[PDB]
Amino acid sequence: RLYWDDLKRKLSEKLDSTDFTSTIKLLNENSYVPREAGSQKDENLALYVENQFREFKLSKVWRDQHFVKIQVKDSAQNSVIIVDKNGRLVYLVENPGGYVAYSKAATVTGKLVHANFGTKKDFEDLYTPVNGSIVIVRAGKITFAEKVANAESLNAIGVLIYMDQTKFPIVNAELSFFGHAHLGTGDPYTPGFPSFNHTQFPPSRSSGLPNIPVQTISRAAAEKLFGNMEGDCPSDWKTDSTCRMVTSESKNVKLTVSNVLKEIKILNIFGVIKGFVEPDHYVVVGAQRDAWGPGAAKSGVGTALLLKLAQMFSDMVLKDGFQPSRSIIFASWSAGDFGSVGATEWLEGYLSSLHLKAFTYINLDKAVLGTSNFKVSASPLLYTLIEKTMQNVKHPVTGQFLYQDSNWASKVEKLTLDNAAFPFLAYSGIPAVSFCFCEDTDYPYLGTTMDTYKELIERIPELNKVARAAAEVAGQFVIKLTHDVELNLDYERYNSQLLSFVRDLNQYRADIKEMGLSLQWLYSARGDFFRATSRLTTDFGNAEKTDRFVMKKLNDRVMRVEYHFLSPYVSPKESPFRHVFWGSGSHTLPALLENLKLRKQNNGAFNETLFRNQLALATWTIQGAANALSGDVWDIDNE
Template structure:
């Protein structure tokens, strides 16, 4: 009878008073046996202790939802392990329902419209209106009773138009006749300030392949390129590598169907992110560093021109553009022998003060680990689609999640940091300066960045750029969230991972991933074609609502996507970062390199060490998965150790063999530079295509350092040094 009673007790709730009464009655009736009574009593005390440990998951202990976060909290010290009292958890289905209900009552369009009122636009970085909006957001975070709201201040160098106008002029080679084509309102920041004259050659989008396919050499010539496909900075870098002396960028009507042919537009030419005059260093309050500048700054002038100006130039050019370009019929290939083009750029450097604004909801178990969700605040021009939508999403998510914590019973295990960045239009300057300021510690604390910039540009497609660590989580979210127009799940294609787009240099999530080694995700509801008004004076609310009539519904869907990612990353005991996804990436790279086995053998090398490193990484991920499955979930020290190993996977793919100052984007998968896997493969191809351009010494270094970076990631994932496979 005693064993049956123990079974009944084990299967019942921890807090059933009737069961306690029954338990004692049975104990008392057991023939007065003191031994059995003591046995029952000992079992009950032990079981109650167990119940106390798992009460967070007990169905009987559903929270009443009256708890609230303190407005000001005390953070644990850097060296102190901090474990607050374990919170009660709502079920995941409860959280999703609560989020959905709160979103259904949110009018995003009113916030977007407010951000585009005269009070806050134009808000170019460092302007009074940019600053006013920064302090509005900080005050709003305080009103929402976030755990803390604050801002940081940076002094950065940006390039603006000078007092003398920029100009594009046509010059007769024989007659000496000169006439001004345009004195543009738009400009390209970080262009070289100079005057150049030469013939003009059309290079399509200005990709490397476009330049390689040109019939006319561009040595000593200016080039004209279409906007789109790649960033302005990449177009200029490609032109410079082919010895062009200047670049003109225009928006053709085929790709950007804008009626107004005179519309000016803006961009930047820095092949990097952050303040290019303090590369690798934070621009805190006039901090003194040796004079330096980013290697990503161009050495040739570059200027945006209107479509009308481009058509005037085409009138003095000859040769039809290839039909494969699918561009305007007016397009021409190069100027005739009678005409040259003269470009003058008079941009000047200016130091400005910018503010990044932050708010935090502190986690209840691991407050020193946090997900960061951010949006660009500034804009050249109105910036409705470029920055107002993202800022509106940021503010409303802060309001909703704070309300869920204060009134709904949501107790995130980890912290949620909301960030409003300035100087995004100049190359994610605000975000990068913050990362540079905390380079040594952020990878130990921030485990994911969610970017809200340009999240709604259309309705037809849902596109994602993300670290592989987030693929599994994104897929779960896509299956949960329905498209607001079609009513169908966002998960439409089992092959969606192969369609994930690489982060562009202009994406604020890029430096988080490639510079700091923090997993990042950026997404958008958009069309197959580019949104035509980004970076122009026509990026206004009226054009946005015209292009996206269901703007409010699409913004709600974007907020639901971000909200689910935030909650899932802060809700579960285990971090939702699938480290095993990098096994496929490493295997794919090894297969690509293996195609060149014969070339590698001719150099007296082999790939055995690379194979071993790949195998060690696979075994390390398998071991970590086993450790997690065998872990005692209620032991927070063990779970924290496992989570620490998971959250550093991305960081260990930053090459330790290159300088963050000289090669800031050190990630071997997603960075830029000779240390990347793509650079190694491109270099190896040269041995077959152009042997004279192949550098065997460089390749030997590339292969060795790549191998050891992968091996280092495997060792770090394995945990303690006595758990590492030392047979390598």
């Protein structure tokens, strides 16, 4: 019988004898780069991962075949041109080599107005309105889809995206890069249902698809455009001196995007190590395999980590006597560059099978981007598991433990649309975690042709050691989640979250008071949820861990925690991200807070009936989660 200490020591022993850089270098060979989604080299890498999973002698290796619609470049070249409104001269600014997937194919001409990052606060604090004009923005703070959506909300006719040197210190000013502008995940032409032949692919378009053209441009093209623009960019933007704000009166910009849809076949590769007690419950570990360019940091690191973790855990089970109570699924996704399409469509295809069975997802994408900071974004249910992991895993460079800030949990940023763990948490209600060794700046070569192994090994000479540390974090996650009779999922964490919610409501108390409403029911629901969590912890303490039946009941009640925060009053097809804490849409608590914020601004932007329904539905979601956690239906106490 092996305990946690034995498993930790053997895991570290196997991590010492693992060569990650060799597999990273193999994934950057010419037979695998570039590996655009659905390409021949993508399938070659999929076959290699499948054969590696078979050679590790996992419990079962299989695959999933999807037919999804992506967007690629057309024979017609996208163009950014400058036209003189006198009509006397036209000037080709750039024929970009990159593009933005899911952009609408159109040609638009108008003024070019500079927005800092495309955020809503950037647009609000802008001198020149953007309605009817083209917007140029920097990348770095939000996804391309969020930028395009914010631009469309103000009736902009086009979006240009570039990488300034201050945010992206790249020597090559003519470097192209790639992205996508779909405000969502998965195949945007099968919104909410799997991209399988059984559906016979009916006509349906995701509401997150933009209706304006958006194109990526080089920094040289951005400076050429600034040459025809006026006005200094604000100092707090902290960008280059060549930055300008609005085009001159005599100059307009013509943007031509002609990207075309393309139906492709993508493969999702899977391997499973079955549990020894409860093999029907499982953790999922996934990594993106596709990439526009070489994708060493974007795809190679994660895929190498997946392969190494699968190999090491298979060796621990077959040779070291590791007996996990629950199963472990290793997944190589494709079409991740288009919005986690493979993972989202797998979730939509097997939601009925994953319901209350898959209890944790661990993402490995972009886990090694630097060495200064260790950043994590996860559901609160995993926070404790993260803390205990950070308190005994040492930094790859400094040698100290990763746990240096005791108030880290209050500074965690929630999962974003571009992260593969976001559809796991917000749509299917599975606790998800993403982590990375990174810098304060963004990795500059993501989505470019310079994301190669040379640049990665040059920026991170300790690449092997950092990859080992990331693999150790992931492996300790897996061991803690699968080795014992207890799940190590901390439901009590959500108490803290609820507190924050009502505190965020306090700044609008007066509004709540003049609409004839009260926050008393929310505080009563908080009390019920806190008491339910306390009763569950007491029952876990008083229970006998060898009594499988009592432990089974308590662990099922634990596994229903994340699911009960999915909004039961919204259509999962039109609003897939149903999680009231970490989803998107008018059913979430942040949406309630933004709608309530609009009441101070005394114009008609505040919607009172919508807010009343939001408050009612959020209150009963919280209260029903507390009631379900408290036990049987007849043991629920009502005032």
